[PDB]
Amino acid sequence: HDVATVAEKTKEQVTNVGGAVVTGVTAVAQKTVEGAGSIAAATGFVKKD
Amino acid sequence: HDVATVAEKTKEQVTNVGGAVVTGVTAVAQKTVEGAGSIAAATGFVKKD
Amino acid sequence: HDVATVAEKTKEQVTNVGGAVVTGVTAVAQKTVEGAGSIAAATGFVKKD
Amino acid sequence: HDVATVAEKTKEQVTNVGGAVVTGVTAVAQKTVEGAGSIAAATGFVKKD
Amino acid sequence: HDVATVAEKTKEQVTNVGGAVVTGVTAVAQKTVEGAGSIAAATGFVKKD
Amino acid sequence: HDVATVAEKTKEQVTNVGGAVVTGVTAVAQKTVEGAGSIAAATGFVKKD
């Protein structure tokens, strides 16, 4: 509707609506993931039906 | 509806609505994850039906 | 509707609506992912029916 | 000289001599490291002159 | 000289002499490293003159 | 000299002499590394004069 990100003299700013936003550092190191229907290393992530 | 992030002379600011936002540092190191239907290392994450 | 990212003298800024945005550093290193219907290393990610 | 790792029916075993060995899980997440000549996140590590 | 790794019915075993061995999971996520002559994220690591 | 890795019914085993061996999972995600003569993300690593 009326979402807003208002400022001045900033560095970073985000306004997501209903999705996914990834803007940072990340590191994953699996070694073994078993089973079916398994999410292993998901960072920014939405999911429905 | 009327969500808002209002300031001045800032550094970081976020306004999520209904999703996922990741803006920080992260590190995961699994070694073994068993079973089915298992989420292993999820950082920003929503989930439904 | 009326989404907005308003500032001045900034460095980075994002306004997603309903999708996915990836603007950061990421590193994944799996070794073995088993099972069917498994998401292994998804960074910015939406999903429906 | 006469270093030795002797056993039976074991799982893990290591015999380092004078170096570095890393065989475990680790996770580091800095955010800001300042200064010169600084070691930030070192896991297995020797150092001389 | 007479270094040795002796066993039976094992899983993992290492015999380094004077170097570096990395056999484990690791994850590093810096964001900002300053200064000159700085080691940031070193896992298995020897160093001389 | 007389270095040795002796076992039976094993899974992994290493015998380095004087160098570097990397046999594991790793993930690094820098964002900014400053300065001169800086090692940023070194995993298996020896170094002299």
Short mmCIF file of C-alpha atoms in Angstrom, two decimals:
data_model
loop_
_atom_site.label_atom_id
_atom_site.label_comp_id
_atom_site.label_asym_id
_atom_site.label_seq_id
_atom_site.Cartn_x
_atom_site.Cartn_y
_atom_site.Cartn_z
CA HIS A 1 0.00 0.00 0.00
CA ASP A 2 1.90 3.03 1.32
CA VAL A 3 5.27 1.48 2.15
CA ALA A 4 8.20 3.87 2.21
CA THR A 5 11.91 4.15 3.03
CA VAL A 6 12.63 7.82 3.69
CA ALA A 7 15.93 9.20 4.97
CA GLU A 8 18.92 11.26 3.90
CA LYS A 9 22.70 10.85 4.11
CA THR A 10 22.50 7.06 4.38
CA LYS A 11 24.56 4.12 3.25
CA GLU A 12 22.23 1.17 2.58
CA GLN A 13 18.47 0.75 2.59
CA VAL A 14 16.00 -1.84 1.38
CA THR A 15 12.25 -1.98 0.86
CA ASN A 16 11.06 -5.45 0.03
CA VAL A 17 7.42 -6.28 -0.48
CA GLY A 18 6.52 -9.94 -0.60
CA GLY A 19 9.70 -11.43 -2.06
CA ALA A 20 13.30 -11.93 -1.07
CA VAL A 21 16.33 -9.67 -0.87
CA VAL A 22 19.89 -10.72 -0.08
CA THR A 23 22.48 -8.00 0.31
CA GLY A 24 24.98 -9.41 2.78
CA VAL A 25 27.91 -11.76 2.85
CA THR A 26 27.25 -15.45 3.34
CA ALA A 27 29.19 -18.68 3.35
CA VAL A 28 27.86 -22.20 3.70
CA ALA A 29 29.84 -25.42 3.61
CA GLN A 30 27.82 -28.59 3.87
CA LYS A 31 29.33 -31.97 3.68
CA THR A 32 26.44 -34.42 3.53
CA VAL A 33 22.70 -33.80 3.42
CA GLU A 34 20.37 -36.78 3.34
CA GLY A 35 16.66 -37.34 2.90
CA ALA A 36 14.17 -36.30 0.28
CA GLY A 37 12.47 -32.94 0.00
CA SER A 38 15.20 -31.26 2.02
CA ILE A 39 16.32 -27.68 1.63
CA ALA A 40 20.05 -27.60 2.21
CA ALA A 41 21.45 -24.08 2.24
CA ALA A 42 18.90 -21.43 1.30
CA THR A 43 19.67 -17.83 2.09
CA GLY A 44 16.78 -15.61 0.95
CA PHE A 45 13.80 -17.71 0.43
CA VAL A 46 9.99 -17.70 0.35
CA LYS A 47 7.81 -20.65 -0.39
CA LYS A 48 4.12 -21.50 -0.78
CA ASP A 49 1.79 -24.40 -1.75
CA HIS B 1 -0.92 -0.47 4.88
CA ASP B 2 0.92 2.60 6.19
CA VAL B 3 4.32 1.13 7.01
CA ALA B 4 7.20 3.58 7.05
CA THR B 5 10.90 3.93 7.87
CA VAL B 6 11.55 7.62 8.52
CA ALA B 7 14.82 9.07 9.78
CA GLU B 8 17.77 11.19 8.70
CA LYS B 9 21.55 10.86 8.91
CA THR B 10 21.43 7.08 9.18
CA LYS B 11 23.55 4.17 8.05
CA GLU B 12 21.29 1.18 7.39
CA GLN B 13 17.54 0.67 7.42
CA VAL B 14 15.11 -1.97 6.22
CA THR B 15 11.36 -2.19 5.71
CA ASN B 16 10.25 -5.69 4.89
CA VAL B 17 6.63 -6.60 4.39
CA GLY B 18 5.81 -10.27 4.27
CA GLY B 19 9.01 -11.69 2.81
CA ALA B 20 12.63 -12.12 3.79
CA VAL B 21 15.61 -9.80 3.98
CA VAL B 22 19.19 -10.77 4.76
CA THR B 23 21.73 -7.99 5.13
CA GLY B 24 24.26 -9.35 7.60
CA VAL B 25 27.24 -11.63 7.67
CA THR B 26 26.66 -15.33 8.17
CA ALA B 27 28.67 -18.52 8.17
CA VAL B 28 27.41 -22.06 8.53
CA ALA B 29 29.46 -25.24 8.44
CA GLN B 30 27.51 -28.45 8.71
CA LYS B 31 29.09 -31.80 8.52
CA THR B 32 26.26 -34.31 8.38
CA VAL B 33 22.50 -33.78 8.29
CA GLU B 34 20.23 -36.81 8.21
CA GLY B 35 16.54 -37.45 7.79
CA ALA B 36 14.02 -36.46 5.17
CA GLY B 37 12.25 -33.14 4.89
CA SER B 38 14.94 -31.40 6.90
CA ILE B 39 15.99 -27.80 6.50
CA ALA B 40 19.71 -27.64 7.07
CA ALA B 41 21.04 -24.09 7.10
CA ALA B 42 18.44 -21.50 6.16
CA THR B 43 19.13 -17.88 6.94
CA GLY B 44 16.19 -15.72 5.80
CA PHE B 45 13.26 -17.89 5.30
CA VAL B 46 9.45 -17.95 5.23
CA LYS B 47 7.32 -20.96 4.49
CA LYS B 48 3.65 -21.89 4.12
CA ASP B 49 1.38 -24.83 3.17
CA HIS C 1 0.94 0.46 -4.75
CA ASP C 2 2.91 3.44 -3.43
CA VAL C 3 6.24 1.82 -2.60
CA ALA C 4 9.22 4.15 -2.54
CA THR C 5 12.93 4.34 -1.72
CA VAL C 6 13.74 7.99 -1.04
CA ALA C 7 17.07 9.30 0.23
CA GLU C 8 20.11 11.30 -0.83
CA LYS C 9 23.87 10.80 -0.62
CA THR C 10 23.59 7.02 -0.36
CA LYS C 11 25.59 4.03 -1.50
CA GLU C 12 23.19 1.14 -2.17
CA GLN C 13 19.43 0.80 -2.16
CA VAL C 14 16.90 -1.73 -3.38
CA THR C 15 13.14 -1.79 -3.90
CA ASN C 16 11.88 -5.23 -4.74
CA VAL C 17 8.22 -5.98 -5.25
CA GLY C 18 7.25 -9.62 -5.38
CA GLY C 19 10.39 -11.17 -6.84
CA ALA C 20 13.98 -11.75 -5.85
CA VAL C 21 17.06 -9.57 -5.65
CA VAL C 22 20.60 -10.69 -4.86
CA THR C 23 23.25 -8.02 -4.47
CA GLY C 24 25.71 -9.50 -2.00
CA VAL C 25 28.59 -11.91 -1.94
CA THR C 26 27.85 -15.59 -1.45
CA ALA C 27 29.72 -18.86 -1.45
CA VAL C 28 28.31 -22.35 -1.11
CA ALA C 29 30.22 -25.61 -1.21
CA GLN C 30 28.13 -28.73 -0.96
CA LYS C 31 29.57 -32.15 -1.15
CA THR C 32 26.63 -34.53 -1.32
CA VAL C 33 22.90 -33.84 -1.42
CA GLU C 34 20.51 -36.76 -1.51
CA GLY C 35 16.79 -37.24 -1.94
CA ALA C 36 14.32 -36.14 -4.57
CA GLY C 37 12.69 -32.75 -4.83
CA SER C 38 15.46 -31.13 -2.81
CA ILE C 39 16.66 -27.57 -3.20
CA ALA C 40 20.38 -27.58 -2.62
CA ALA C 41 21.86 -24.09 -2.57
CA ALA C 42 19.38 -21.38 -3.51
CA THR C 43 20.22 -17.80 -2.71
CA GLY C 44 17.38 -15.51 -3.85
CA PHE C 45 14.36 -17.55 -4.37
CA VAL C 46 10.55 -17.45 -4.45
CA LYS C 47 8.30 -20.36 -5.20
CA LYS C 48 4.59 -21.13 -5.59
CA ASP C 49 2.20 -23.97 -6.56
CA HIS D 1 62.32 -38.60 15.58
CA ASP D 2 60.25 -41.58 16.76
CA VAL D 3 56.75 -40.11 16.74
CA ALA D 4 53.93 -42.60 16.41
CA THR D 5 50.14 -42.96 16.48
CA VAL D 6 49.38 -46.59 17.33
CA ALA D 7 45.92 -47.99 18.02
CA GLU D 8 43.26 -50.25 16.56
CA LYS D 9 39.51 -49.98 15.96
CA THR D 10 39.57 -46.18 15.91
CA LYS D 11 37.72 -43.43 14.10
CA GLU D 12 40.07 -40.46 13.66
CA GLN D 13 43.73 -39.88 14.40
CA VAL D 14 46.35 -37.32 13.48
CA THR D 15 50.12 -37.06 13.73
CA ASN D 16 51.37 -33.63 12.84
CA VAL D 17 55.02 -32.70 13.01
CA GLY D 18 55.84 -29.03 12.72
CA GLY D 19 53.01 -27.81 10.51
CA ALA D 20 49.26 -27.37 10.70
CA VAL D 21 46.31 -29.72 10.48
CA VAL D 22 42.64 -28.76 10.42
CA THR D 23 40.09 -31.55 10.53
CA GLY D 24 37.10 -30.02 12.30
CA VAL D 25 34.17 -27.81 11.54
CA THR D 26 34.63 -24.06 11.81
CA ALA D 27 32.66 -20.93 11.12
CA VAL D 28 33.81 -17.34 11.40
CA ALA D 29 31.82 -14.22 10.60
CA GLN D 30 33.67 -10.96 10.97
CA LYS D 31 32.15 -7.68 10.16
CA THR D 32 34.95 -5.13 10.37
CA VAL D 33 38.65 -5.60 11.09
CA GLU D 34 40.88 -2.54 11.21
CA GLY D 35 44.58 -1.87 11.49
CA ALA D 36 47.59 -3.03 9.54
CA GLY D 37 49.38 -6.33 9.94
CA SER D 38 46.33 -7.94 11.50
CA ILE D 39 45.40 -11.58 11.22
CA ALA D 40 41.64 -11.77 11.04
CA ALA D 41 40.33 -15.33 11.12
CA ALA D 42 43.08 -17.94 10.97
CA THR D 43 42.25 -21.49 11.91
CA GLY D 44 45.36 -23.68 11.60
CA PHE D 45 48.33 -21.50 11.51
CA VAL D 46 52.07 -21.37 12.21
CA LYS D 47 54.30 -18.40 11.66
CA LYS D 48 57.97 -17.44 11.96
CA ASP D 49 60.38 -14.54 11.22
CA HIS E 1 62.40 -39.50 10.75
CA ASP E 2 60.27 -42.44 11.93
CA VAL E 3 56.80 -40.90 11.91
CA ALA E 4 53.93 -43.33 11.58
CA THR E 5 50.13 -43.60 11.65
CA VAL E 6 49.29 -47.22 12.49
CA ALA E 7 45.80 -48.54 13.18
CA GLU E 8 43.09 -50.75 11.71
CA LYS E 9 39.35 -50.39 11.12
CA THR E 10 39.49 -46.60 11.07
CA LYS E 11 37.70 -43.80 9.28
CA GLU E 12 40.11 -40.88 8.83
CA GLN E 13 43.79 -40.39 9.57
CA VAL E 14 46.46 -37.87 8.66
CA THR E 15 50.24 -37.70 8.91
CA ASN E 16 51.56 -34.29 8.03
CA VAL E 17 55.23 -33.44 8.20
CA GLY E 18 56.13 -29.79 7.92
CA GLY E 19 53.32 -28.51 5.72
CA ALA E 20 49.58 -27.99 5.90
CA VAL E 21 46.58 -30.27 5.69
CA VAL E 22 42.93 -29.24 5.63
CA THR E 23 40.32 -31.96 5.73
CA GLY E 24 37.37 -30.38 7.50
CA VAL E 25 34.49 -28.10 6.75
CA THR E 26 35.02 -24.37 7.03
CA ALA E 27 33.12 -21.19 6.34
CA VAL E 28 34.35 -17.63 6.63
CA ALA E 29 32.43 -14.47 5.85
CA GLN E 30 34.35 -11.25 6.22
CA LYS E 31 32.90 -7.93 5.42
CA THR E 32 35.75 -5.45 5.63
CA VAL E 33 39.44 -5.99 6.35
CA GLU E 34 41.74 -2.99 6.47
CA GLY E 35 45.45 -2.39 6.76
CA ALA E 36 48.43 -3.62 4.80
CA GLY E 37 50.16 -6.95 5.19
CA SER E 38 47.08 -8.50 6.75
CA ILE E 39 46.06 -12.12 6.47
CA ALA E 40 42.29 -12.22 6.28
CA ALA E 41 40.92 -15.75 6.35
CA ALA E 42 43.61 -18.42 6.20
CA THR E 43 42.70 -21.96 7.14
CA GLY E 44 45.76 -24.21 6.82
CA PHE E 45 48.78 -22.10 6.73
CA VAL E 46 52.52 -22.05 7.43
CA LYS E 47 54.82 -19.13 6.88
CA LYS E 48 58.51 -18.24 7.18
CA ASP E 49 60.98 -15.40 6.45
CA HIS F 1 62.47 -40.41 5.91
CA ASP F 2 60.28 -43.31 7.07
CA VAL F 3 56.84 -41.69 7.05
CA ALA F 4 53.92 -44.06 6.71
CA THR F 5 50.12 -44.25 6.77
CA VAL F 6 49.20 -47.85 7.59
CA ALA F 7 45.68 -49.11 8.27
CA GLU F 8 42.93 -51.25 6.80
CA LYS F 9 39.20 -50.81 6.19
CA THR F 10 39.42 -47.02 6.16
CA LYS F 11 37.69 -44.19 4.36
CA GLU F 12 40.16 -41.32 3.93
CA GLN F 13 43.85 -40.90 4.68
CA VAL F 14 46.57 -38.44 3.79
CA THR F 15 50.35 -38.34 4.04
CA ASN F 16 51.75 -34.97 3.17
CA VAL F 17 55.44 -34.19 3.36
CA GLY F 18 56.41 -30.56 3.09
CA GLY F 19 53.64 -29.21 0.88
CA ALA F 20 49.91 -28.62 1.06
CA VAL F 21 46.86 -30.84 0.83
CA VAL F 22 43.24 -29.72 0.77
CA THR F 23 40.57 -32.40 0.85
CA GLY F 24 37.65 -30.75 2.62
CA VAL F 25 34.82 -28.41 1.88
CA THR F 26 35.43 -24.69 2.16
CA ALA F 27 33.60 -21.47 1.48
CA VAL F 28 34.90 -17.94 1.79
CA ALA F 29 33.04 -14.74 1.00
CA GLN F 30 35.03 -11.56 1.39
CA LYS F 31 33.66 -8.21 0.60
CA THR F 32 36.56 -5.79 0.82
CA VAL F 33 40.24 -6.41 1.55
CA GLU F 34 42.59 -3.46 1.68
CA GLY F 35 46.32 -2.94 1.97
CA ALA F 36 49.28 -4.22 0.03
CA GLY F 37 50.93 -7.59 0.41
CA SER F 38 47.81 -9.08 1.96
CA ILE F 39 46.72 -12.68 1.66
CA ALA F 40 42.96 -12.70 1.46
CA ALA F 41 41.51 -16.20 1.52
CA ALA F 42 44.14 -18.93 1.36
CA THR F 43 43.15 -22.44 2.29
CA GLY F 44 46.17 -24.76 1.98
CA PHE F 45 49.23 -22.72 1.91
CA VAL F 46 52.97 -22.75 2.61
CA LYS F 47 55.33 -19.87 2.08
CA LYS F 48 59.04 -19.06 2.39
CA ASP F 49 61.57 -16.27 1.67
#
